[PDB]
């Protein structure tokens, strides 16, 4: 299917102010270590004033913080979700299925991803590296997509609709009961991974 509209809107929703991509990659790499991230740690990595870190994050409405005010979630998160995302000996989580496909390339590490089919509850898993997917179980695994909204919180408008399914026919049956969602579409996990690759290429091309 044609994926340009999805790539365009996700980039628009993710890149709200200059420096967002510059901040996002280092942040994901820090979160993948499995501990909360302080704004001063980010400031030092980037060579920015901590105020500026704060300004970028403030536009990032969905950002999750802990009781200490440290960052614990921005796409990749320490707070439990339906999408388990493990890097070596650290268990992390992700906000949605497409996230699990995108982050390995940005972090530079291979992740073991696991979840359950949104329609049937069957366990699903795969291994996602920066360049390819492997051990897709079951082999016909699928993903749902919707068109992201520009002036909405990304979790409410996109992430909550983007799931894994046991198969394409199972996903399509599920989708038949989900009208009024702009751009709702079912793709194989392979097609979704390719969408992630194209998104990443465009995102990285906007960094320093
Ligand atoms: Br198009």
Curated annotation (Swiss-Prot):
Its EC number is 4.99.1.2. Pfam families: HTH_15, MerB. The keyword Lyase applies. It is an enzyme of class 4 (lyase). Keywords: Lyase, Mercuric resistance, Mercury, Plasmid. InterPro entries: MerB, MerB_HTH_dom, MerB_lyase_sf, WH_DNA-bd_sf. GO terms for biological process: response to mercury ion. It catalyses: an alkylmercury + H(+) = an alkane + Hg(2+). The keyword Lyase applies. One of its GO terms (molecular function) is alkylmercury lyase activity. Cleaves the carbon-mercury bond of organomercurials such as phenylmercuric acetate. One product is Hg(2+), which is subsequently detoxified by the mercuric reductase. Belongs to the MerB family. This is Alkylmercury lyase. It comes from Escherichia coli. The gene is merB.
